[model samples]
Target: DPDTAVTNKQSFSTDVIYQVFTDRFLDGNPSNNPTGAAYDATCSNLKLYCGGDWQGLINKINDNYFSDLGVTALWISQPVENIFATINYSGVTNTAYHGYWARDFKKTNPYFGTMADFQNLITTAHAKGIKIVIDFAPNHTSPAMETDTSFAENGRLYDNGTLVGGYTNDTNGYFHHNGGSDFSSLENGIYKNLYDLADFNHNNATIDKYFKDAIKLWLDMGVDGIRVDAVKHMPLGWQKSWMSSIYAHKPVFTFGAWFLGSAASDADNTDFANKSGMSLLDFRFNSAVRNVFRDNTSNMYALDSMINSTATDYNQVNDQVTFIDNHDMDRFKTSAVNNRRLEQALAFTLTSRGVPAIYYGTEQYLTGNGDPDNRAKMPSFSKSTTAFNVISKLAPLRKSNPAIAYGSTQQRWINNDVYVYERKFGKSVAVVAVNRNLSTSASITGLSTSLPTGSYTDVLGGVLNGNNITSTNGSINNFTLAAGATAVWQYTTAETTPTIGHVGPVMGKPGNVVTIDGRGFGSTKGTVYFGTTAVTGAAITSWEDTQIKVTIPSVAAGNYAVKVAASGVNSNAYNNFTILTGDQVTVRFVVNNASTTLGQNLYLTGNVAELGNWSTGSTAIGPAFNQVIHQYPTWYYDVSVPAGKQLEFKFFKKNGSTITWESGSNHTFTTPASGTATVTVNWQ
Candidate 1:
C-alpha cells in the first residue's frame, strides 16, 4: 500500500529548509546556460539565467554544503520548462530564470538540466537525508499580451511540447479573459489576470486534468514536497480538490505561499489554510521578525503578541513555514548597520516554531531590497561566518529536542529591547532570550523557565556573544544579556506523557494509513481516534516511542480533533484532522427553483463524507452552495467529491440554528471516473 511508502508519510517538522533560487545559486555546469540575450555569465543581471542547475545542487549535496549548516531540506525554484524567449517590457529585458514563467508543466527545464540530472540531484540529496521541495505555480503561465501575440510566446501552454492552448486564441476557455486585478478583493483576484500573466481557468475540465497529470509525473520522480505559488489568487475549493488528487496519488508534505504584512489580520488566509488541505508560508511571522529586528518599526512586545496571536489563528502553527526573508521582499540584513542583527534573526528563526526556512545567502550577510535584488547570487558557502555558525548550532536542536519542534510557546519576560520565551513539550524544555540593544546590556530579572535546576551553556558557544544560564527553583538566576546577543538553553528528558507532535498526509480516505510522529507514544499499541470514532486493533499497523502508523477511520468528512491514548492516558489533541472521500473530482452543483430568505442560505450535504454526511450545523454544513453566478432562484457551488461513486445529496436553507430541508427523497447521481462533472436538479 502507499501508506507503507516512506515518501507518503513524511513530515518536515524536525527539518530546517534552505530556500534556493536556482539561477542565482552555484553554477556547476556552464554549458547549459541560456545563450544570447537570456544569458548572464556573471549573474550581475539577476533577471537572466546564470546557469545554476540540478548538477549544481547535486555537487553541493555531495560536498556537504547543506549538511554543514544543519539544513535537512532544500526548497528550490520550479523545475518545469519555461519560455525560452527573452521579453522586453518597456525596454527592460527579462528571462524566466526565476522558474515562475512556465511553458510546459510536463517536462523539465533544459536550462536547469535534463531529466537525468534532476534524478541524480534527488538521488544525491536523498542519500544525504535532505528532502526537496519544488515551487509550483498553477495559477498562471508565462507573461502574455493579446495585443502582441508574438511577444514572449503569448502565454502558450504545452503538454510535453504538444501545444494545448494559448492566450491569444483561447476558444476552449482554458484561460480567464478578465481584466487585470487591482488586488482589492478575492473575487476580483480569482478571475482577473495577475499583471500580464495568463490566469488559468481551473473550472475547465481539460485544464484541470492536464495540471493534475503533470504533477503526478513529478511525484513519481521522487520529489518530497511542493510549495504552491500565489495561493491567495486561487479558489479555496479548487485548491482543496487539487490537494486531494495529490494525496490520493502519493501523499507528500505541501504548503502554499500567501504573503501577508506585519500584524495583518488573516481571517481569509486562516480559513483557506485550515480548509485547503495544505499549510502556508508564515508571512505574518516573517514580517514581524523583520520589523522588530531590522526595521525598528516594532518592538519585542509587539513581536511576542504577533507570535502568540498567530498560534491561535493558524490551525497547525507548526506546519507553517517560517522564514526571515525571501525572493519577494527585502532581505533581513537590508537596513541593518550591524551584522549581529542578521545573526540574531537567524538564531531566532532556527529555534522558533514551524519548519524554519533560510533564504540562500542570508548567512553570507547578503544585502538587497525587492525583486531581482532580493534574489541575488550566493555570495559564498563559508562556514566561518557568525550567522552560519549560529544556524549550525541551533538548527540541529529541532531534531534533538522535541521541545523545539513540537512545543508550545510561552513568553516568560519581555521589554522593548529584550524578550525571553520558553518552549515546552512534556519533559523537554528550551528557553531562548534575545537582547536587541546594540550599545548596552539588559539586566534580566524574574525570568522563569521549565528547565531543571542546573547550569547550561549557550548553544552557540558564545557566538553572537551569547552567555550561559543557571536555573534555580525553575527560575533563571539574574544575569546580564549582552547587547545584540541571543542565548539558548534547553533541557530534554525521556518523555513520560504520550505526546503527538505531528501527523502527515493529514487528509486521506478511510483505510489510508497516516504516520504520527512524536515522543511518548509507547511501544505498546494505543488507541487513535478521528473525532470520537476510535481506531484500534488491525487498523494500527505499527507503534513505537516516537512514531505510530494508523489507518484513518471511516469518519464523516470534515475537520476532526485527532487524539491518541497510550495505556489509557490521553495525549494532547491535534486539531484540524481532515478526512477525505478518496480520489476527488470537482463537481458543480446547481439547483433551480430554490428560493431563500435574506439570512437563510442554501447548503449542500449528503450521504458521502465529502458532503458533511448530511449535517446542518454551522461548522458541519458544507459550502454555502450559493453564489451570484445563476442569480436568485438558482444557486450553484463547485465542490470536490469522491469520483466514480454513487453520490446522494440535498439542499437546505439554514437560518441561525433552524434548518429547512428540501422536500425530496434524495438527489442521486454518479460522478465521472476522472474529469470534472456537473449535477443540475430542480428543488422538489
Candidate 2:
C-alpha cells in the first residue's frame, strides 16, 4: 500500500471518486449477525441484510483496487450505529443493512465491527492514495429505545415512570417525541407517521457541537473529507455555521446534498453550495444525461444544451461531480440496449468536463431500475462479466490528461443517433465520440487538431487514427466513428524523435539539388531545409519530442531534407537528401560583331569542353542572338556581304544554361573581299 498526501483544495478537482455502500463492501466476521431474528441469508433482496463490513473495504485497499483503478477518492456510507431491529410495512421488510438509520451517533454499529475497524478502514484507504469521505446524517435517527420500545408509540420515560411531551426534560431531552415524521412535513403542531426518531434542533448549541464533533472525529481518524447527507432538509443557517466550523479544524473539502429541481433551482442550489465552501453532486446533470443517453431520446441537442447550460450557470462546473446513474437512480444497463446505453454514457461522463463518480458494481452491469434495486450488493470481484478493465483504463486517461480532468467542454455535433464533444485545456485536447446505432458507422465532425496525428489505442475501438478525424481548428476536432463505438484521444505536449539511419550531404549535378529526411525536428518556426534554403509553406504533419514530420516547398534542382536551426543552436547536420533530377537545360546570351566591310564571308566555330560535338541547323533550338540565324548546332556559315556587316554566333547546351561564343585570336577566318571585319560570340 502507498499513501499520497492531499494538502490542498485542488486535489478534488482531479479526483476520480468511487462511491461504496459500506455493508456491501466486505464482511470480516459473521459473529456480529443479529441473533434470534430471521436474517435474509441470501442477500438477494436489497431490502434485506447483506453481510458487508469495513474489513472488506480494507481487503480491497490491501489488494490495491483503488490504485489499480486510479481512484483518488472513496465516498462511504454513514458510519453511525443503526437500530438493531427490522421494520416491516405492507409485507415488505426494510432492514438497516445500509447504515442510514442511526440509533446512536456516539457509538459504531456492532454489525460493522468495532471502532478500530472504522479507523483502520480510513487509514487503509489513505495508504492506497484514496481520500476517505464518510457520510454524515444530520436530519434524524432510528426509533428503537434501549428498553426495546418504539419511541413513536410511547413518550420518553423518566427515572421513575413519567411521560414527557417536549425534549426539554432531562431524561426526555435526549429524544424528540414528534412521531416518525420529518420536521419539514409537520405544520404548526400536526404530525404524520408514528415512528419516534429523535430530530435534533439545529438552533441548539449542544446539538451543533455534537454534529461538529462527529466531523472532527472522522477527520482526526485520517479521513480526508465528508459528505453531508440530507443537507437540504437541515436548516440552511445551521449548515453554513457547521461547514465553517468543520473547515476551521482542517481544510476538508465538503459536498452537500442540496436536491433541487429545474434549471433555475439547480442554479440556485449550485450557487448556495459553492458559497458555503462546498462542492455539489450535480443531480440535474444526472437527470439530463439519463434522459438524453439512456432514454433513447431523439433530441441529441438536449445533451449539449444541458451540459452547456450547467457549465454556464456555475463557474466551477468542472469541479461538480457528474454521474449517469447512482444509488438513488435507476441502474444504467438494466433496460433495452437503446435504453441502456451505459457504455456510451460512461464514456461521455469520463471524457466530459467534470469530476466523474462511478457507483459500485456499475462496471459489472448492475441493474437496479429504482431505489432498493439500485442500492444492491457488490458483485464478486472475480466476476467474468465485469467491465473493470474499461474503467481501469478510463480512470488513468482522465488522470493523465488535464483536458479530461479540468478543461473547457464543447459539444461539437449531436444527432439522435450520435454525439461528439471535446475537452480542451491549453495545448492539450481530447475528443470523445459515441454512436447510439449498434451496428452502423456514425459520421461526426468538428474535432480539434490538437489530437495527435497517427493511430491510438482506443477503449471501444482497438485502434483509431487521424484518418477518422475530419476537422480541427483552434480547440475543436471532429471524427467519424463506428456505431456503438466510443473513441478518446488525448493530445500530449511531449515530443518524440524518430530514429534516423543515415546522415550525409546529398549529391547533385553542377546545378542540380539534394534533400535530407529525418525526425525530431523541433518547433516549426525558423526551420531551414536544403542547406541555406528556408523551408517555406511547411506544414507540421505530426510532432513529439522524438518525432516530427514536415512538408517543404519544391526545391530548385537539388537534394535536400529537414535541417533544423533555431535560436543559434543548429541541429546535427542531416544528410539523407533526395536529388532533384532533370534532363534538358537552357541558357540565353547576346552576340556582338563590329565590322565595316561589304561582301565578307566569316567562318565561325565554338567548343564546350564538358559537352561533346555541337552541330547547328535552321531551328529555334540554339540560343537567341541578334543578327544571327535561328538554328540548332549551326556554329558557322558565310556571312551575308553588305556594307558594315559583321557576324555574331551564340550556343546552347542540350540540357544546360545557354551560352554564346566569340571568335577571337583562337580561331578566325578572313573576310573575303571585305574591309576590316570582326566577329564576336559568347560561350558557357
Candidate 3:
C-alpha cells in the first residue's frame, strides 16, 4: 500500500529489456575460459563455459543491435567473482560460469573481464539510451576463499584466519546460514560436492552497510537498475528495509526474484514490495501467460481464469514485469518446440497489461532445454528475424498509447485456440488479437470499437476499414484471424462531413432497416429517419456522422436525412450538411462448369463496371465461390459452388477505383444445372 515516491527520470514506461547470461553471451578472453587451470572439457559441458564476457556485450551495444531492436535496457547476469577453484558435484557436470557462484561480492569476476569493462558496458549502454540492469545477489554468495586475494578483503571474516568455509558474518558478528543446502544442490538438491553459498546476515548492521555500499558502487557507476535475484530466500524484513534505503538515494526502479506460489501469497509479496518502496516482478502473471500461450490445451483456460480471478492492491497489472521465459526457465522456443505459438506467446506478453521483458536471443530463435543451455550464446546479429522487429515496433506504441501500458484490460474473447483483449485508457483504446493454433483460424468477437469511426491501421499488420469492423452497442467488435497472426489496432473517431443535399441509393433488404447516407445531418441526439413519413417505435440499427440506418416506417418511399435536436446537455447542434449519391457498380462473371472431374481445371472470367488494370500483376481483382479461390491479376479461379446455393459475386477494380455499375443490389444466379453460370455485366 506504500507507493514509493521515487520518481525515476529514466523512461521505465518504454522499456524493451533483453536478458543475457554473461558466460554464454561472448568469450572475449579465452584465457579465462578454463578458469584457473582446473579445466576439464570432458567432465564439464563446454556450453556452460563458453566464456562470454562484458566486452562481447559492449560489441553488441556498439553495433546497434540493442538500438535496432528498440531495447531500452539490458539485464545481464551477476558479475560477482566466482569461487576460485572448481568444485565438481557428485552428479552435476558443469562448473559455475553463469556468475551465480559469488565467491566475493566486493570484487568482480576475472572471467567476465575487469570491473572497468563492466563500467564501460554500463556507460556504453547508457549512451545508446539502454539502461543497464546488473544482477544483484542479495540472497547468497559463493563459498569463502582459503586466502584473501582481493583488495577489499580487509574487513571480511575468515574461518580461523583461513577462508576455507562460507561466511557467518562480516568483520562484525552476524549469522549467515539459513539452513539451506549448498549452492551445488540449490537448483534441485541432487548433490552436495560444491561449497555452500554464503547467505548474508541481513540483520547484522555491519553486513547490511557492506551490501549497501557494494550496490551503490554500481549505481554510482551510471547503472540504471538492479534486479535482485532470489529475494524469496532472503528475510522479508531485510528486503523491505533495504529497498527503502535503496530508493532513498536514487530513483532506481528495482524488482526482486520472489518465486511466490499462489496469487494470494504473491499479493503479500506485492504488498511488501510496494510498501518497501519497490516493485516485484509479476511471476504470477508470467506463469499464467506461459501456460495459456504454451500449454493452452491442457490447463490454459484454468490459467486464464486464475489470472482474472487474482487481483492486486497497487496497480499490479501495470507495474509488474511480465515475462514468459527468463534465464532460469526453459527457453520458450525449445519448450514450445519452435512452434509459431511462441509468437502467440510473445503477442500476449507484449500486448498484455504489464511491462513485458523479453529474454535475449529469443528473437533469434534461440533454443535450449535447461539452465546452461537456456543461457546460450547470443545469436549472430545478421540473422533475418521478425521477432526483433515486432518487439521494436510494439515498444513505442505501448509508450505512446497508455491503453497498452497502464490501461484497463479485459479479455474480450477467449477460446481453445484464440485470445483477444482490449486495453482502454481514457478515450484511446487498443485491441490485441492472437491465434495460438498452428494451422487453424479463429473468430474473435465481443470487442468494443469505441474508437472513432475511420480507417485505423495496425502498427504490426496493416490497415482496417471502418466498414470492415462491426461493433455491437459499443461493447463488441468481431474479427476472424488466421493462425499465428497477431494484430494491434488503434482507434480514433472519424472526422468528415457529408456534402449537402446528397442522397445515396437505399441500402438493405425490403423488411430490414436501411441506412440513408447524405448531408444536412443534425448533431441532435435520437434523430430518427422515416420512409417518407415519421412513424413510432421504429428500430434504429446504427448512426454516424454522415449516415444513419433505421427500420423503414409504414409510409411511402422517399429519400431523406433526418434532422433532430441534440439529446444530452453537452451535445452539438446540427450544422454540417452533405448529400452525395452512392456509387452503383455491377460485376458479371462467367464460370466454366463443364468440367466433370473434381480436379478438372476451371476458368473464372469477370468484368468490373470501371476500366482498370486486369493484368497478372494486380492483387485487388479476385473471384469468389463456395470453396477456396485464388486471387489473380485479372480474376480469381479454381472455384466450386456448394450444392443448392446460388453463386453470388462482386467485382472491384484492380487499382481500387470506383466501379460505374448498378450497385446496392445483389445479383444472384443458381449454379448452372451442369457446368457454370454466365451473367452479363452492365454499368449505369
lDDT of each: 0.85, 0.54, 0.52
Model 1: per-residue lDDT, tens digit, 108-185?
A: 999889999889988888888888899999999989998789889999999998999999978998998876899876
Candidate 1 ranges beyond 4 A from true positions:
1-9, 335-337, 590-609, 613-636, 645-669, 680-684
- CA RMSD of all predictions: 3.1, 34.6, 29.1
Worst 10-residue lDDT window for candidate 1 reads 1-10
Candidate 2 overall Cα lDDT vs. reference? Answer: 0.54
Give the worst 10-residue stretch by lDDT in candidate 3: 1-10
Q: Would you list the rank order by lDDT, best first?
A: 1, 2, 3
Instruction: Report the number of the highest-lDDT candidate.
Output: 1
Tens-digit lDDT track of model 3 for 270-327 = 5445433345677777667666666554444654565565443543345467787887
TM-score on alpha carbons, each prediction: 0.93, 0.63, 0.62
**Candidate 2, residues 577-634: lDDT per residue as tens digits?**
4332222111112233323123322222233210111334221222222222222222
- Those runs of model 3 whose alpha carbons end farther than 4 Å from true positions after fitting are 1-11, 29-48, 91-94, 144-172, 181-195, 260-268, 297-307, 310-315, 335-338, 462-478, 492-684
| Ranked candidates, highest TM-score first | 1, 2, 3
How displaced is residue 160 in candidate 3, in Å? 20
